[PDB]
Design a protein around this ligand. Sequence first.
Ligand SMILES: Nc1ncnc2c1ncn2[C@@H]1O[C@H](COP(=O)(O)OP(=O)(O)O)[C@@H](O)[C@H]1OP(=O)(O)O
Ligand SMILES: CCc1nc(N)nc(N)c1-c1ccc(Cl)cc1
Length: 161
Amino acid sequence: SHMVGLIWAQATSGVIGRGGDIPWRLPEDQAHFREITMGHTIVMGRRTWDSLPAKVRPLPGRRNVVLSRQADFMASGAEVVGSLEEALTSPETWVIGGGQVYALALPYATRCEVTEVDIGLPREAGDALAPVLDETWRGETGEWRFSRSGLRYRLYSYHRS
Ligand SMILES: Nc1ncnc2c1ncn2[C@@H]1O[C@H](COP(=O)(O)OP(=O)(O)O)[C@@H](O)[C@H]1OP(=O)(O)O
Ligand SMILES: CCc1nc(N)nc(N)c1-c1ccc(Cl)cc1
């Protein structure tokens, strides 16, 4: 067990998901997600696993871990753990969602890698929302850049002891 990180992409408001979908199209965030997580362990909740397309899961080049209370759960190509702490035995672990897993994982986390999408989506009932940090987290909020489509985004890299 070692470094636990959270990785997510949010609208400025904190929305990460609405209606079961990512609320924007941003291939550069796909590339950023891949570059942060490749070669490491990724942890997701069972509902997140179930949402992925059958031919996309497990995400290649990473040790995929699915958290579930169901010992019989089938997650072909991944491992299933029944507690989060077991999900963090790896030397470097990125939690990728969803909200229940972020909330369990936040107390272990010492790094967050965030993509802020410049899009105005005030929160609505039902939205999936980003984890909330505080003034004990510190680090770099990067400059805005345009994606190829013109959607603007910037990157946060935060840490704590
Ligand atoms: N404390 C816990 N221990 C074990 N599994 C847990 C857990 N909290 C959440 N989970 C699992 O993680 C699932 C939630 O996945 P998620 O975090 O991707 O969902 P959501 O996106 O809806 O927040 C839960 O339904 C549960 O899986 P099962 O329903 O298969 O048991
Ligand atoms: C590429 C989307 C993405 N972007 C960032 N920045 N973080 C993430 N956690 C995800 C993501 C969420 C759920 C799954 Cl299943 C896979 C990836």
